[PDB]
Design a protein around this ligand. Structure first.
Ligand SMILES: [Mg+2]
Length: 181
C-alpha cells in the first residue's frame, strides 16, 4: 500500500505528526435542526440535499491555531469527504491541517473504521492521535491522547485543557516515554 501522507515538509520533518478526528472531537453535527448552530451546510445523500447542523466545540479556534504551529496536523475522520471537507474548510482558517484523510483511508477492521497509524508514513515515536473513540486506534493505544466526546456542553474546556499537555509532548524526543510503550 501507498502511504497515506506524502514527504514531510522540511519544516515538519522533526515535528510530531498529530492525527485529529472530527465528529465529537472538534465538532458535533446533526440532521435535526438545532438552534445557534455554527455551520449549516448542505450534504447530498442518495440524491437528496439535507441540511447539516454543525456546532463547534468551545475553544476549537484557539486549539487549531496553536496545534497547527506546534505539529504536523492531519485530519483523519471516518466520515465522508462530502461532509468533512466543507466543515474542515470553515474550521481551519490557519492551514493547520497539512492533509485530510477520510473514510476510505480507514481500515474496516472487525466492524470498525480503524485508523492504522503505521499507515501514515511517520516515525511512530513521533505520532499522536486524538479521537474520542478508542476503537479508532486499536493498533496504537500508546500513541493516543484521550479526549472526551463532545455534543453540546458550552462549558466544555477539554480542547483548552489539552494544549498544555500537547505543549509538553512537543518537547519530548519520543512520545512513548510519556504515553509509555
Ligand atoms: Mg469521533
Amino acid at each position: 500500500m501507498q502511504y497515506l501522507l506524502p514527504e514531510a515538509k522540511a519544516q515538519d520533518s522533526d515535528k510530531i505528526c498529530v492525527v485529529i478526528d472530527l465528529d465529537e472531537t472538534l465538532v458535533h453535527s446533526s440532521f435535526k435542526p438545532v438552534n445557534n448552530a455554527d455551520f449549516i451546510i448542505p450534504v447530498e445523500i442518495d440524491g437528496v440535499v439535507h441540511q447539516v447542523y454543525v456546532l463547534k466545540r468551545p475553544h476549537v479556534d484557539e486549539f487549531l491555531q496553536r496545534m497547527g504551529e506546534l505539529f504536523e496536523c492531519v485530519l483523519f475522520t471516518a466520515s465522508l469527504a462530502k461532509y468533512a471537507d466543507p466543515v474542515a474548510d470553515m474550521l481551519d482558517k490557519w492551514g493547520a491541517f497539512r492533509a485530510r484523510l477520510f473514510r476510505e483511508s480507514c481500515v474496516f477492521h472487525r466492524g470498525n473504521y480503524v485508523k492504522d497509524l503505521s499507515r501514515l508514513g511517520r516515525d511512530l515515536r513521533r505520532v499522536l492521535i486524538m479521537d474520542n473513540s478508542p476503537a479508532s486506534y486499536v493498533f496504537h493505544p500508546d500513541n493516543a491522547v484521550p479526549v472526551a466526546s463532545w455534543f453540546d456542553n458550552m462549558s466544555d474546556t477539554e480542547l483548552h485543557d489539552l494544549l498544555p499537555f500537547f505543549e509538553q509532548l512537543s518537547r519530548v524526543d519520543d512520545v512513548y516515554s510519556v504515553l509509555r510503550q
